[PDB]
Design a protein around this ligand. Sequence first.
Ligand code: HEM
Length: 398
Amino acid sequence: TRIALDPFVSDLEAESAALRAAGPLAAVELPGGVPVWAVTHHAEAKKLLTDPRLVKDINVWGAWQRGEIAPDWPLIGLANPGRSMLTVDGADHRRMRTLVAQALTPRRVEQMRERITKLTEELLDRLTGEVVDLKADFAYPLPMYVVADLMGIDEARLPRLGELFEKFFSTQTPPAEVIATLTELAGIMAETVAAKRAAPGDDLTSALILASEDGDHLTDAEIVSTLALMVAAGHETTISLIVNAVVNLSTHPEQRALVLSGEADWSSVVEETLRYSTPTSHVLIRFATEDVPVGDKVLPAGDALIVSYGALGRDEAAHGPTAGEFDITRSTENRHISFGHGPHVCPGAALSRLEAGVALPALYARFPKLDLAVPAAELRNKPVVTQNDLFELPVRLG
Ligand code: HEM
Protein backbone atom coordinates (compact mmCIF):
# COMPACT_ATOMS: atom_id res chain seq x y z
CA THR A 1 0.00 0.00 0.00
CA ARG A 2 2.95 2.30 -1.00
CA ILE A 3 2.22 4.94 -3.74
CA ALA A 4 5.14 4.83 -6.27
CA LEU A 5 5.53 8.36 -7.77
CA ASP A 6 5.76 8.16 -11.59
CA PRO A 7 9.09 9.73 -12.70
CA PHE A 8 7.51 10.56 -16.18
CA VAL A 9 4.66 12.40 -14.32
CA SER A 10 2.05 10.83 -16.72
CA ASP A 11 -1.00 11.50 -14.48
CA LEU A 12 -0.11 14.16 -11.86
CA GLU A 13 -3.88 14.64 -11.21
CA ALA A 14 -4.52 10.94 -10.26
CA GLU A 15 -1.31 10.68 -8.09
CA SER A 16 -2.29 13.89 -6.18
CA ALA A 17 -5.83 12.42 -5.63
CA ALA A 18 -4.27 9.13 -4.39
CA LEU A 19 -1.89 11.02 -2.00
CA ARG A 20 -4.73 13.04 -0.42
CA ALA A 21 -6.79 9.78 0.08
CA ALA A 22 -3.78 7.96 1.69
CA GLY A 23 -3.04 10.99 4.01
CA PRO A 24 -2.35 12.84 6.16
CA LEU A 25 0.84 10.66 6.15
CA ALA A 26 1.12 8.49 3.00
CA ALA A 27 3.69 5.70 2.39
CA VAL A 28 5.38 6.51 -0.95
CA GLU A 29 8.18 5.12 -3.17
CA LEU A 30 10.42 7.69 -4.91
CA PRO A 31 11.75 6.72 -8.37
CA GLY A 32 14.49 4.03 -8.03
CA GLY A 33 12.56 2.20 -5.24
CA VAL A 34 13.33 4.48 -2.21
CA PRO A 35 10.60 4.40 0.47
CA VAL A 36 9.64 7.65 2.31
CA TRP A 37 6.55 9.27 3.90
CA ALA A 38 4.65 12.13 2.19
CA VAL A 39 2.54 14.59 4.24
CA THR A 40 -0.44 15.12 1.86
CA HIS A 41 -2.88 17.21 4.00
CA HIS A 42 -2.62 20.97 4.81
CA ALA A 43 -3.01 21.04 8.63
CA GLU A 44 -0.53 18.16 9.22
CA ALA A 45 2.02 19.65 6.75
CA LYS A 46 2.03 22.97 8.71
CA LYS A 47 2.60 21.07 12.03
CA LEU A 48 5.47 19.00 10.55
CA LEU A 49 7.05 22.09 8.85
CA THR A 50 7.27 23.84 12.29
CA ASP A 51 8.28 20.60 14.14
CA PRO A 52 12.00 20.81 15.15
CA ARG A 53 12.16 16.93 15.14
CA LEU A 54 11.93 17.01 11.27
CA VAL A 55 15.39 18.15 10.05
CA LYS A 56 17.33 18.45 6.74
CA ASP A 57 20.44 16.67 8.27
CA ILE A 58 20.94 13.57 6.04
CA ASN A 59 22.90 11.85 8.96
CA VAL A 60 19.38 11.28 10.47
CA TRP A 61 18.20 9.25 7.44
CA GLY A 62 18.62 5.62 8.64
CA ALA A 63 18.50 4.15 5.07
CA TRP A 64 21.32 6.60 4.04
CA GLN A 65 23.57 5.85 7.10
CA ARG A 66 23.14 2.02 6.47
CA GLY A 67 24.48 2.39 2.84
CA GLU A 68 21.02 1.40 1.36
CA ILE A 69 20.79 4.44 -1.07
CA ALA A 70 22.49 3.72 -4.45
CA PRO A 71 25.25 6.36 -5.00
CA ASP A 72 23.83 6.94 -8.58
CA TRP A 73 20.19 7.22 -7.33
CA PRO A 74 18.89 9.91 -9.75
CA LEU A 75 17.51 12.03 -6.79
CA ILE A 76 20.72 11.89 -4.66
CA GLY A 77 21.49 15.48 -5.85
CA LEU A 78 18.17 16.73 -4.35
CA ALA A 79 18.41 14.58 -1.17
CA ASN A 80 22.14 15.28 -0.48
CA PRO A 81 23.07 18.78 -1.82
CA GLY A 82 26.05 20.97 -0.73
CA ARG A 83 25.66 23.16 2.46
CA SER A 84 23.22 26.13 2.07
CA MET A 85 20.29 27.72 3.95
CA LEU A 86 18.46 24.67 2.40
CA THR A 87 20.30 21.97 4.44
CA VAL A 88 20.46 23.50 7.98
CA ASP A 89 17.95 23.89 10.87
CA GLY A 90 17.82 25.61 14.25
CA ALA A 91 20.23 28.41 15.23
CA ASP A 92 22.51 27.97 12.10
CA HIS A 93 19.40 28.29 9.87
CA ARG A 94 17.94 31.29 11.79
CA ARG A 95 21.30 33.12 11.35
CA MET A 96 21.19 32.62 7.52
CA ARG A 97 17.47 33.60 7.22
CA THR A 98 18.02 36.76 9.33
CA LEU A 99 20.96 37.85 7.10
CA VAL A 100 19.20 36.91 3.80
CA ALA A 101 16.02 38.79 4.93
CA GLN A 102 18.08 42.04 5.29
CA ALA A 103 19.08 41.69 1.56
CA LEU A 104 15.95 40.18 -0.22
CA THR A 105 13.51 42.70 1.35
CA PRO A 106 9.91 43.34 0.23
CA ARG A 107 11.13 46.83 -0.88
CA ARG A 108 14.12 45.45 -2.93
CA VAL A 109 11.60 43.17 -4.70
CA GLU A 110 8.98 45.93 -5.26
CA GLN A 111 11.76 48.18 -6.72
CA MET A 112 12.25 45.54 -9.52
CA ARG A 113 8.64 46.23 -10.83
CA GLU A 114 9.73 48.74 -13.59
CA ARG A 115 12.71 46.58 -14.79
CA ILE A 116 10.46 43.42 -14.89
CA THR A 117 7.84 45.51 -16.86
CA LYS A 118 10.57 46.60 -19.39
CA LEU A 119 12.02 43.02 -19.71
CA THR A 120 8.45 41.67 -20.24
CA GLU A 121 7.74 44.37 -22.93
CA GLU A 122 10.95 43.41 -24.89
CA LEU A 123 10.08 39.64 -24.77
CA LEU A 124 6.49 40.38 -25.98
CA ASP A 125 7.95 42.62 -28.82
CA ARG A 126 9.88 39.56 -30.16
CA LEU A 127 6.84 37.25 -30.39
CA THR A 128 6.15 36.52 -34.11
CA GLY A 129 3.88 34.03 -35.89
CA GLU A 130 0.25 33.11 -35.17
CA VAL A 131 1.08 30.20 -32.84
CA VAL A 132 4.12 30.19 -30.50
CA ASP A 133 5.65 28.16 -27.68
CA LEU A 134 4.81 30.71 -24.93
CA LYS A 135 7.17 28.82 -22.52
CA ALA A 136 10.31 28.88 -24.74
CA ASP A 137 9.49 32.35 -26.24
CA PHE A 138 8.22 34.29 -23.18
CA ALA A 139 7.93 32.54 -19.75
CA TYR A 140 11.38 30.76 -19.90
CA PRO A 141 13.76 33.72 -20.42
CA LEU A 142 11.93 36.30 -18.16
CA PRO A 143 13.05 35.02 -14.68
CA MET A 144 16.67 34.55 -15.87
CA TYR A 145 16.85 38.20 -17.01
CA VAL A 146 15.11 39.28 -13.77
CA VAL A 147 17.32 37.30 -11.31
CA ALA A 148 20.54 38.36 -13.17
CA ASP A 149 19.48 42.04 -12.79
CA LEU A 150 18.32 41.50 -9.16
CA MET A 151 21.70 39.91 -8.32
CA GLY A 152 23.69 42.54 -10.25
CA ILE A 153 25.24 39.93 -12.57
CA ASP A 154 27.18 41.42 -15.53
CA GLU A 155 24.75 41.85 -18.44
CA ALA A 156 27.53 40.51 -20.73
CA ARG A 157 27.15 37.04 -19.10
CA LEU A 158 23.44 36.58 -20.06
CA PRO A 159 24.19 34.50 -23.22
CA ARG A 160 26.26 32.03 -21.10
CA LEU A 161 23.66 32.02 -18.24
CA GLY A 162 21.01 30.86 -20.75
CA GLU A 163 23.32 27.94 -21.75
CA LEU A 164 24.05 27.07 -18.05
CA PHE A 165 20.30 27.27 -17.10
CA GLU A 166 19.33 25.03 -20.04
CA LYS A 167 21.93 22.35 -19.00
CA PHE A 168 21.21 22.67 -15.25
CA PHE A 169 17.42 22.12 -15.65
CA SER A 170 17.44 19.72 -18.70
CA THR A 171 16.07 16.20 -17.94
CA GLN A 172 18.81 14.90 -20.41
CA THR A 173 21.90 16.32 -18.57
CA PRO A 174 23.88 13.45 -16.90
CA PRO A 175 24.69 14.01 -13.17
CA ALA A 176 28.47 14.66 -13.81
CA GLU A 177 27.53 17.55 -16.16
CA VAL A 178 24.81 18.96 -13.78
CA ILE A 179 27.65 19.20 -11.17
CA ALA A 180 30.04 20.91 -13.70
CA THR A 181 27.23 23.34 -14.73
CA LEU A 182 26.52 24.18 -11.04
CA THR A 183 30.34 24.68 -10.52
CA GLU A 184 30.51 27.22 -13.42
CA LEU A 185 27.33 28.96 -12.10
CA ALA A 186 28.92 29.22 -8.58
CA GLY A 187 32.05 30.63 -10.34
CA ILE A 188 29.86 33.37 -11.92
CA MET A 189 28.36 34.07 -8.44
CA ALA A 190 31.90 34.28 -6.84
CA GLU A 191 33.06 36.72 -9.59
CA THR A 192 29.85 38.77 -9.00
CA VAL A 193 30.54 38.86 -5.21
CA ALA A 194 34.25 39.86 -5.71
CA ALA A 195 33.16 42.73 -8.08
CA LYS A 196 30.45 44.03 -5.68
CA ARG A 197 32.91 44.07 -2.72
CA ALA A 198 35.10 46.50 -4.83
CA ALA A 199 32.07 48.44 -6.24
CA PRO A 200 28.97 48.11 -4.00
CA GLY A 201 25.65 48.79 -5.89
CA ASP A 202 21.83 48.66 -5.42
CA ASP A 203 21.60 44.86 -5.98
CA LEU A 204 21.02 41.68 -3.95
CA THR A 205 24.71 40.60 -4.06
CA SER A 206 25.85 43.96 -2.56
CA ALA A 207 23.05 43.63 0.11
CA LEU A 208 24.11 40.03 1.03
CA ILE A 209 27.74 41.29 1.41
CA LEU A 210 26.49 44.18 3.66
CA ALA A 211 24.00 42.17 5.81
CA SER A 212 24.98 41.87 9.47
CA GLU A 213 23.51 40.96 12.89
CA ASP A 214 25.69 42.19 15.87
CA GLY A 215 28.96 41.99 13.83
CA ASP A 216 28.04 38.56 12.27
CA HIS A 217 27.78 38.43 8.42
CA LEU A 218 27.74 35.77 5.62
CA THR A 219 31.08 34.25 4.48
CA ASP A 220 31.96 34.29 0.75
CA ALA A 221 30.90 30.57 0.55
CA GLU A 222 27.46 31.36 2.16
CA ILE A 223 26.87 34.28 -0.27
CA VAL A 224 27.84 32.14 -3.29
CA SER A 225 25.69 29.14 -2.10
CA THR A 226 22.71 31.48 -1.39
CA LEU A 227 22.90 33.08 -4.89
CA ALA A 228 23.32 29.61 -6.55
CA LEU A 229 20.42 28.17 -4.47
CA MET A 230 18.16 31.14 -5.41
CA VAL A 231 18.74 30.37 -9.15
CA ALA A 232 18.03 26.65 -8.66
CA ALA A 233 14.93 27.38 -6.53
CA GLY A 234 13.43 30.36 -8.49
CA HIS A 235 13.84 29.74 -12.27
CA GLU A 236 11.60 26.84 -13.43
CA THR A 237 9.20 27.38 -10.47
CA THR A 238 8.45 31.01 -11.60
CA ILE A 239 8.27 29.82 -15.28
CA SER A 240 5.70 27.10 -14.28
CA LEU A 241 3.65 29.64 -12.23
CA ILE A 242 3.28 31.83 -15.41
CA VAL A 243 2.65 28.73 -17.64
CA ASN A 244 0.10 27.17 -15.25
CA ALA A 245 -1.73 30.56 -14.90
CA VAL A 246 -2.13 30.76 -18.76
CA VAL A 247 -3.28 27.05 -18.82
CA ASN A 248 -5.80 27.67 -15.96
CA LEU A 249 -7.28 30.84 -17.63
CA SER A 250 -7.35 28.94 -20.99
CA THR A 251 -9.33 25.98 -19.51
CA HIS A 252 -11.61 28.29 -17.40
CA PRO A 253 -12.80 30.86 -19.98
CA GLU A 254 -15.55 32.36 -17.71
CA GLN A 255 -12.84 33.24 -15.14
CA ARG A 256 -10.53 34.54 -17.90
CA ALA A 257 -13.47 36.84 -18.86
CA LEU A 258 -13.68 38.03 -15.19
CA VAL A 259 -9.97 39.05 -15.03
CA LEU A 260 -9.77 40.49 -18.64
CA SER A 261 -12.96 42.56 -17.85
CA GLY A 262 -11.33 43.89 -14.59
CA GLU A 263 -13.94 42.16 -12.28
CA ALA A 264 -11.21 39.90 -10.78
CA ASP A 265 -7.62 41.11 -10.05
CA TRP A 266 -4.46 39.40 -11.42
CA SER A 267 -3.32 38.64 -7.80
CA SER A 268 -6.36 36.30 -7.41
CA VAL A 269 -5.24 34.41 -10.59
CA VAL A 270 -1.63 34.00 -9.26
CA GLU A 271 -2.66 32.94 -5.69
CA GLU A 272 -5.31 30.50 -7.00
CA THR A 273 -2.76 29.08 -9.56
CA LEU A 274 -0.29 28.54 -6.61
CA ARG A 275 -2.91 26.58 -4.49
CA TYR A 276 -4.54 24.68 -7.39
CA SER A 277 -1.41 23.96 -9.55
CA THR A 278 1.84 24.74 -7.64
CA PRO A 279 5.02 24.51 -9.71
CA THR A 280 6.44 22.38 -6.83
CA SER A 281 4.56 19.08 -6.35
CA HIS A 282 6.98 17.61 -3.69
CA VAL A 283 9.88 18.96 -1.59
CA LEU A 284 12.76 16.65 -0.65
CA ILE A 285 13.60 16.09 2.13
CA ARG A 286 13.25 15.86 5.94
CA PHE A 287 14.20 13.18 8.54
CA ALA A 288 12.65 12.42 11.99
CA THR A 289 15.14 12.67 14.95
CA GLU A 290 12.46 10.84 17.07
CA ASP A 291 9.02 9.18 16.56
CA VAL A 292 6.45 11.83 15.45
CA PRO A 293 2.70 11.15 15.71
CA VAL A 294 0.95 12.30 12.43
CA GLY A 295 -2.83 11.76 12.78
CA ASP A 296 -3.46 8.14 13.83
CA LYS A 297 0.02 7.19 12.43
CA VAL A 298 3.61 7.45 13.71
CA LEU A 299 6.50 8.76 11.59
CA PRO A 300 9.37 6.54 12.90
CA ALA A 301 12.71 8.10 14.04
CA GLY A 302 15.18 7.88 11.10
CA ASP A 303 12.49 7.75 8.39
CA ALA A 304 12.27 10.31 5.54
CA LEU A 305 9.49 12.86 4.85
CA ILE A 306 8.62 14.75 1.64
CA VAL A 307 6.01 17.54 1.64
CA SER A 308 3.41 16.94 -1.11
CA TYR A 309 2.50 20.63 -1.78
CA GLY A 310 0.73 19.65 -5.04
CA ALA A 311 -1.63 17.19 -3.32
CA LEU A 312 -2.37 19.32 -0.23
CA GLY A 313 -3.18 22.46 -2.36
CA ARG A 314 -6.63 20.89 -3.08
CA ASP A 315 -7.25 19.84 0.59
CA GLU A 316 -11.05 20.02 1.16
CA ALA A 317 -10.36 20.29 4.94
CA ALA A 318 -8.42 23.59 4.31
CA HIS A 319 -10.40 25.15 1.38
CA GLY A 320 -13.94 23.60 1.60
CA PRO A 321 -15.87 21.47 -0.94
CA THR A 322 -14.60 23.44 -4.06
CA ALA A 323 -10.86 22.74 -3.16
CA GLY A 324 -10.69 20.41 -6.22
CA GLU A 325 -11.58 23.22 -8.69
CA PHE A 326 -9.83 26.34 -10.07
CA ASP A 327 -11.88 29.35 -8.78
CA ILE A 328 -10.10 32.79 -8.73
CA THR A 329 -13.15 34.16 -6.75
CA ARG A 330 -12.74 31.74 -3.76
CA SER A 331 -12.33 32.92 -0.16
CA THR A 332 -10.52 30.30 2.01
CA GLU A 333 -10.07 30.43 5.83
CA ASN A 334 -6.59 28.93 5.11
CA ARG A 335 -3.98 30.77 2.96
CA HIS A 336 -2.20 28.21 0.70
CA ILE A 337 1.30 27.05 1.77
CA SER A 338 2.69 26.54 -1.76
CA PHE A 339 5.65 28.74 -0.61
CA GLY A 340 6.16 26.47 2.47
CA HIS A 341 5.62 27.28 6.16
CA GLY A 342 7.76 27.81 9.26
CA PRO A 343 11.50 28.49 9.19
CA HIS A 344 12.29 27.28 5.58
CA VAL A 345 9.39 29.35 4.03
CA CYS A 346 10.30 30.57 0.48
CA PRO A 347 12.34 33.80 0.65
CA GLY A 348 11.50 34.36 -3.08
CA ALA A 349 7.66 34.40 -2.68
CA ALA A 350 7.36 38.22 -3.29
CA LEU A 351 9.67 38.04 -6.34
CA SER A 352 7.77 35.19 -8.09
CA ARG A 353 4.43 36.90 -7.23
CA LEU A 354 5.79 40.17 -8.79
CA GLU A 355 7.14 38.50 -11.99
CA ALA A 356 3.77 36.71 -12.59
CA GLY A 357 1.75 39.81 -11.49
CA VAL A 358 3.65 41.89 -14.14
CA ALA A 359 3.98 39.23 -16.91
CA LEU A 360 0.33 37.98 -17.09
CA PRO A 361 -1.53 41.33 -17.49
CA ALA A 362 1.25 42.47 -19.94
CA LEU A 363 0.83 39.26 -22.07
CA TYR A 364 -3.02 39.51 -22.28
CA ALA A 365 -2.79 43.35 -22.83
CA ARG A 366 -0.70 42.54 -25.98
CA PHE A 367 -2.77 39.39 -26.96
CA PRO A 368 -6.21 39.60 -25.24
CA LYS A 369 -7.55 36.70 -27.41
CA LEU A 370 -4.55 34.35 -26.72
CA ASP A 371 -5.50 30.71 -26.08
CA LEU A 372 -3.92 27.23 -26.28
CA ALA A 373 -3.10 26.14 -29.88
CA VAL A 374 -3.77 22.48 -28.73
CA PRO A 375 -6.37 20.88 -26.40
CA ALA A 376 -5.32 21.01 -22.68
CA ALA A 377 -5.17 17.14 -22.69
CA GLU A 378 -2.28 17.27 -25.24
CA LEU A 379 -0.08 19.30 -22.77
CA ARG A 380 2.78 17.06 -21.37
CA ASN A 381 4.53 17.15 -17.92
CA LYS A 382 8.35 16.99 -18.06
CA PRO A 383 9.77 13.85 -16.33
CA VAL A 384 10.72 15.77 -13.12
CA VAL A 385 8.92 14.01 -10.26
CA THR A 386 9.14 16.96 -7.73
CA GLN A 387 8.06 19.69 -10.24
CA ASN A 388 4.86 20.51 -12.23
CA ASP A 389 6.65 21.64 -15.46
CA LEU A 390 5.34 21.38 -19.09
CA PHE A 391 7.50 20.56 -22.15
CA GLU A 392 5.83 23.52 -23.98
CA LEU A 393 2.83 25.89 -24.06
CA PRO A 394 1.64 26.12 -27.73
CA VAL A 395 -0.48 29.29 -27.82
CA ARG A 396 -2.58 30.99 -30.57
CA LEU A 397 -1.95 34.75 -29.92
CA GLY A 398 -5.11 35.83 -31.89
C1 HEM B 1 6.40 30.08 -7.86
C2 HEM B 1 7.70 30.10 -7.56
C3 HEM B 1 8.20 29.39 -6.36
C4 HEM B 1 7.66 28.41 -5.57
C5 HEM B 1 6.37 27.63 -5.79
C6 HEM B 1 8.57 28.19 -4.49
C7 HEM B 1 8.36 27.25 -3.44
C8 HEM B 1 9.24 27.03 -2.42
C9 HEM B 1 8.96 26.24 -1.29
C10 HEM B 1 7.67 25.45 -1.10
C11 HEM B 1 10.05 26.28 -0.47
C12 HEM B 1 10.15 25.56 0.85
C13 HEM B 1 10.39 24.09 0.73
C14 HEM B 1 10.20 23.43 2.12
O1 HEM B 1 10.83 23.84 3.11
O2 HEM B 1 9.38 22.48 2.26
C15 HEM B 1 11.00 27.15 -1.10
C16 HEM B 1 12.24 27.40 -0.62
C17 HEM B 1 13.12 28.30 -1.22
N1 HEM B 1 12.86 29.13 -2.27
FE1 HEM B 1 11.21 29.23 -3.28
N2 HEM B 1 9.60 29.01 -4.61
C18 HEM B 1 9.46 29.76 -5.72
C19 HEM B 1 10.27 30.76 -6.19
C20 HEM B 1 11.49 31.15 -5.68
C21 HEM B 1 12.27 32.26 -6.04
C22 HEM B 1 11.95 33.25 -7.17
C23 HEM B 1 13.42 32.20 -5.25
C24 HEM B 1 14.61 33.06 -5.07
C25 HEM B 1 14.72 34.27 -5.46
C26 HEM B 1 13.29 31.09 -4.39
C27 HEM B 1 14.23 30.74 -3.41
C28 HEM B 1 13.99 29.78 -2.45
C29 HEM B 1 15.03 29.38 -1.50
C30 HEM B 1 16.40 29.96 -1.42
C31 HEM B 1 14.48 28.45 -0.70
C32 HEM B 1 15.11 27.73 0.49
C33 HEM B 1 14.67 28.38 1.82
C34 HEM B 1 15.13 27.59 3.05
O3 HEM B 1 15.18 26.33 3.01
O4 HEM B 1 15.41 28.25 4.09
N3 HEM B 1 12.10 30.51 -4.63
N4 HEM B 1 10.48 27.64 -2.30
